[PDB]
Amino acid sequence: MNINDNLSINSPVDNKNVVVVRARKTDTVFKAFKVAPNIWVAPERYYGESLSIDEEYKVDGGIYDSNFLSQDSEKDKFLQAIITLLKRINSTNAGEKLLSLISTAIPFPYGYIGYRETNYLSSEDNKSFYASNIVIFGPGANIVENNTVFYKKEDAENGMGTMTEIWFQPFLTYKYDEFYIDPAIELIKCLIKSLYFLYGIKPSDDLVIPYRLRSELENIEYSQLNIVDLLVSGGIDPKFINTDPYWFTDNYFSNAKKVFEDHRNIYETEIEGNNAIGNDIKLRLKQKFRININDIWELNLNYFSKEFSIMMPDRFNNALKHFYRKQYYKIDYPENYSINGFVNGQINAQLSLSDRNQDIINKPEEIINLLNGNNVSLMRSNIYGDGLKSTVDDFYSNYKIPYNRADSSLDNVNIGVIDNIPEIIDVNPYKENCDKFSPVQKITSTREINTNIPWPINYLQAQNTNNEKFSLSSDFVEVVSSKDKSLVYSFLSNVMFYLDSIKDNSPIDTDKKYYLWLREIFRNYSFDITATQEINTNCGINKVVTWFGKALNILNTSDSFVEEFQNLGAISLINKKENLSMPIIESYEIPNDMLGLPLNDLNEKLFNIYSKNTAYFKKIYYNFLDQWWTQYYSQYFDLICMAKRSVLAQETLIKRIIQKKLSYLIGNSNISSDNLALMNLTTTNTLRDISNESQIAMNNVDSFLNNAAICVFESNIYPKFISFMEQCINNINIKTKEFIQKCTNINEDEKLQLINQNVFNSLDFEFLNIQNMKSLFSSETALLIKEETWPYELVLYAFKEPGNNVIGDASGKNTSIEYSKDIGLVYGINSDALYLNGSNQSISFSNDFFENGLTNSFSIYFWLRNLGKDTIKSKLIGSKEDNCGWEIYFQDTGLVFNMIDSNGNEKNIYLSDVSNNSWHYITISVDRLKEQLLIFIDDNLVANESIKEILNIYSSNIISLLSENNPSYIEGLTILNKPTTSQEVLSNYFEVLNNSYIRDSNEERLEYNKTYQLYNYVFSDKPICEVKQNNNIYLTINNTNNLNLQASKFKLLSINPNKQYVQKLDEVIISVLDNMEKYIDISEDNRLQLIDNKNNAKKMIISNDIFISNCLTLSYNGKYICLSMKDENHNWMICNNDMSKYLYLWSFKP
Amino acid sequence: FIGFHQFNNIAKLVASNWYNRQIERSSRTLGCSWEFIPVDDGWGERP
Structure with a gap:
């Protein structure tokens, strides 16, 4: 928005929005551009860190390039990129408030020996000073690691506040599941953290909570995360620390709130209304204090994730280095990315792989050495650490749950008011405002460990080959002992079986033969990868991923993983089973001063103790839930990630197999040039269909393993809690009975009624809510992903505005709509229907999915009322090019559904009696997995046919609704990328109807x-x-x-x-x-x-x-x-x- | 549909056809979804 757009790297120094300033107290100088009041961008590498570092100090997952951001061309691209991202953030009310707050957030000034500001940049000659809260640099040594640093540590911890420097990387992003990380949210994270620095509320480096149990290591060791990063980073993890009531505290919070009030007071009494100061400062201060400290603690990525509809990683999102190997993609502004974010969103954006991926430093936390009986090495696999600091040591054992207790955070930020505060012009500089910046140095330790039993990371690694020629094998031992070594490990049984069935066949020559092959390759892959079986467990029915054991070598020693898992239960999938630490409590004593109180007062004082207690129970439960997450879920999430990686590894094998066959036919065969052309276009669509199938499978392992983890909480953790709690209330019950008997000033009838009022039983602490367990994993991101990936490719809506008729698509896909200007609207069944007059009126919908292909499935439905006249065959709606695709025609008294492939094979099917001039609900379902066509009229199933004979229906990306010669009404037109069942049809039909x-x-x-x-x-x-x-x-x-x-x-x-x-x-x-x-x-x-x-x-x-x-x-x-x-x-x-x-x-x- | 929109820092009740362009349940957070709370003996604060 109104972020300053007027800048380029060659912009002259004006001493106002473009300056050349000194970096801390060093001899070094740099150019900075002011994009907003108090907010600067300095489009070069961070000055404070050497660009060339020793090999020993390069961190895992880092990319080190000393010539990155050296050229003027790169610097400008950078400067524009940041400006672009700040524009996007400022273009949404939430992020507009964030920037406005940061702008007015200037650190507290020091006093006379008039007031001296600490937030400014110095000119090289040291006679000019420029107000800055925030300065955004490019990366330090490691060019994929963002960072947020403080100008002066002391001022960041003491309530004054300090300037903040940011190191950012706009040009690289990575994929997490189905989506690309949005740099806009990555920057918002850095910005949120600076709030802590600007307010002077930065916590001790030692205020740290358990994040992840390191279940990879032989010994007991935890990864820790500073409270700041936990509160800012969002995701699910924080829900465990931030709770109501709080089971975790520290003096940090109560003290920060204290010092904040001190500084507010100094402002209120002194600075405000003081004419010796001036508005550009005191007015900003006034706004800085409209905020509450709590608002900053409550502010995090989950909120912006929602407000911006941005997907972000939601689980252990500060540990991802361990769970995932990142692969980086280039982002060009503004071709890939603009003020609306990624062009075509985070899922379908087309981004190029970075040539830097090969430069990534790989330094494993531990290496798994898999030997055989003869003690010789078969394989050496890498496990990577999360990057976080560790222990030391166990937190849960030594943490006492305190018995005595002592949404929107930007609501109070006023954008209009702030934007009218004149910029800080005359700055009186405070001399020592900064620390010598000292770079962090890190040496990464690696553990070697030997095993005769393959770990999951072993089975994973066996699923990769660099061999241009390779063969799929289901024998793990054979694969790693290969004398080839051409074999690669695969669990795809249907695919391997199909490949074998065609082994002796005459080579593929016709394009028809390629299609028949490619289709069977696709169906079998789908059958293999999406395989699930529902089983009865301790906690219910779970939908199990059938291949899970064969993929990761888990419960894989049986002939069946499924039955072995049904047998042993959810806890049998992970390596460290008992991690719990019974928490240390605050023992129970009733004051000796109440011994003689009168009833009414004794009564209502025990009521207070009753509440404190039941709250205390809740705290304990929370503590157990956090341990579950940290110790147990962490291990199931590892399983989820490895299983997902297995799916990708397999998918890759498949695509390579397909690509080789296509590449070969194109290389040498008599197949016609433009038949090859179609083959190439079509295969591309099939490769997408294969990703969509892979995606279903990656969702399967997520549900499966999340349910398992929740079952482990019910079956394993929860009961340990219940044990601990009945020992606890048994004790409390004792002490409370003994207390009441010793009461002097009440009688015996009073004692019995009192003991009864105050007694605890198991129901007072049975907190398990299974729906809440499940709701944990529904994040904004999980939802956004659902809505972006749902089956709707077209959902037609229409309504009447005054002087305007509106037609649009709600699918949330790329569908473009073009239609006659004069098309009218009429109320249909449930909504406004389109009226096509039959003569000049037409409407057309454009989506790349619409072209179909060989392997995809789809459904078409809509309501139609036809004022039936002629019998003559006429186009109603269809997608056709080069005489392929599908069309629905008006014919005789009915419709005809036509389907035709590139080889000439056809479905031509008459649907009787549809033009009675009554509304009808048409449903058509095309299922390539079952090779089945289904046609419904209203609540009846009019056709059920095999389509095994129809191969490649590739058409245009345009569906045309013509309705030639037959004026009609069309309503609720929908296209789906999946087939429709009879239950769904009935449900659609009747639901809409009432x-x-x-x-x-x-x-x-x-x-x-x-x-x-x-x-x-x-x-x-x-x-x-x-x-x-x-x-x-x-x-x-x-x-x-x-x-x-x-x-x-x-x-x-x-x-x-x-x-x-x-x-x-x-x-x-x-x-x-x-x-x-x-x-x-x-x-x-x-x-x-x-x-x-x-x-x-x-x-x-x-x-x-x-x-x-x-x-x-x-x-x-x-x-x-x-x-x-x-x-x-x-x-x-x-x-x-x-x-x-x-x-x-x-x-x-x- | 009746909903709200930010004008300056004020959230003003609005009728906006932007809602009618949307599919049904989108997120859990709508802005056009409302609750009507009658005074009830079962809740009973002081009006």
Whole structure:
């Protein structure tokens, strides 16, 4: 937004927004650009760290380049990139507040020996000083590591506040699961942390909580994380430390709040209103103190993740180096990334791999040496540490849970007010405002350990080859003992089986043969990788990943991993089973000063102790939950990551196999040039289909393993808690009974009632909530991912704005819509429907998915009402190019669904009787895994066919809705990337159908004051007619064929003039036009008759059956309306409850 | 739909067709979803 855009690396020094300033007290100088008040960008490498460092000091996962950001071209690209990111952050209210706060957050000034500011940059000549809170540099030595440093440690810890330097890397990002890290949130993290430095609230380096149990190591060792980073970094982890009530504290919090008030006070009494100071400072201060210290502690990435709809890693996100090997991708501004973030979002952005990936330093935490019986090395695998500092030592054992207790954080930031504070111009500099910057040096220790039993990291490593030629094998021992060594380890049974079945076959020559091959390759991969089996466990039914044991070598010694896991339980999957440490408590003593109190006071004082206690219980439980997360979940998340890596390794093998075959045919075969062309385009789509299938599998292992971890809490941790708690309340119960007996000033009847009031039982501490356990893993990110990856490729919406008709796509995909300007909208079934006139009107939807291919599945559905005239075959909707793809046609009285591949194979299927000028729900389902086509009309399944004979349907990326020659209505058009089942169709159809509206015979909304004819469900072609008997007139139907009774004309009336459409439960008056207007009444015989006087008219309740879409029911005083027995012969309309259910269904036809 | 929008630092109740362009449940956080709280004997603070 209004971040300063006017800068380039060649911008001249103006001494206002572009300066050349000294770095701390060094001899070194650098150029800085002011992008916002008090906020500068210095587009070079951080000055404080040497660019070339000794090999011994290079950290794992680091990339070291001394010539990076050396050139002017690079520097500008940097400067623009940061400016771009700050613009994105400022373009959303949340991040706009963050920047505004940071801007006004200037550190507290020192006093006379008038006031001296510590936040400024010095000109080289040291006669000019520029206000700065924040300065953003490029990386230090390691060019993938962001950093946030303080100008002066003392001022960062003492409540004054200190300037903050940031080291940032806009040009590289990595993939985590299905998404790219968004540098915008990575920068927001650095910015949030600076808040701690600007306020002078930086905690001791020693204030540190347990993060991850290092379950990789033979010994007991924890990784720790400073409170600052935990609170800022977001994700799930913090939910365990930050709790209500708090089980974890430190003087830091209470003291920070204390000093903050001291400084606020110094401001209030002295600085504010002091004319010796000036607004650019005191006004900013006033805003800095509108905040509460708590607001900063409560502020973190999870909040911006949500406000910006940015995906971020949500679990152990400061330990990722251990769980993951990062692969870096280049980001170019603004081609890849702009003020709206990644072009095409974090999932589908097209980013190039960095050539730097090969320069990444690899320094394992430990190395797993796998030998054989002869003590010779088969394999050496790497395990990487998280980077965090460790122990020392065990926190849970020595931590006492305190018995005595002593959303939005940016709400109080005012953007308008802050933006009107003149910039700080005359600065009176405080001389020593900074520390000599001292670079951190780190030597990385590596452990070698030997095993005759393959670890998961071994089985993983065996799933990679650099061999251009390789063979899949299911024997791990054979793979690593290979005399080839061409073998690579694979669990894909269906794929390996298929590859073997075709081993002896004549080579692939036709394109048709390539497709048949590629398709079977795809189906089998899907079957292998998405395999799950539901099992009964201690805690329930879990959907188990079938190949898990064969992948990681876990419970793999059986012939089946699944049954062995059902047997041994969730805890059998991890290496360290007993990590718990019973926490140290605060022992229970009731004061000796209450011994003589009177009842009322004794009473209400034990009530206080009762609450403190039950709160204390809750704290203990929390402590157990944190240990679970740290000690146990950490190990299941390791399993999740390794399992996910296994899936990628396998996927890679598959793609390489496919790529080789395609590459080979293109290399030497007689296949036509443009057939090869199609093959190339098509295979690409198949490779996407393979990732989508891989993704389903990576979700499978996430649910499976998360459930397991939760089962371990119920089955293993929780019961240890319950043990500890009944020892605890057994004790408390004792001491409280002994206390009450020793009470002097109360009687014996009082003692018994009191002991009873104050006694604890197990229910007081049974806190397990399984739904809460499960909800832990639903983060903003998990949700965002769901919405980005759901099956909708097109969801058509339409509505009427004043003077405008709106049509759009809600799928959240890339769909582009182009349509005739004059297309009209009309209310359909549940919403506004598009009207196509058949002549000039058309609409078209564009999505790369729409082209289909060989291997993808999809569903098309929509509501359609056709004013049916001609029988002649006419395009309605379809996607076709080069005579491939699919089309739905109007033909005869029906539709035709057509499907045709590049080899000429066709589906041409007539769907009878769809143009009655009544709404119909069309569902078409194409399933390549089951090779099955399904076509539904309304609630019926009209076609079920094999499509094994249809191969490559690649079409354009455009679906065209033409509706040639047949004016029609189309509503709720949807495209899905998955097949549809019959349950889903029924659910879609009926759910949409009950919106409270009653419908006419055509399923259009029933209207008041509109003329209809009335028909009973049982005789559907016979309209109600009027007949007089004794000088008065009744309602019947015509069973004497052409007795020339005239169809009677009906109109529904409402007590409310403003009411237009008829709804479920409405009160109604039925009228008829004969000579005058006649209104319906009930006789004493319960036979309906037309009368003279609206006053006497009976008010009836109209309603409908949920499963009968075009029909309605009518009742009076609970008595429903139906057709009588034969009489005259005539069948009278009667109010009676004893007839067959079918006779109570009516419909109005206009 | 009736919802709210930030104008300066004020959150003003708004009718905005931007909602009608959205699919149903999106996140858990809508801005156009409301609750109607009647005075009830079961809660009973002082109005």
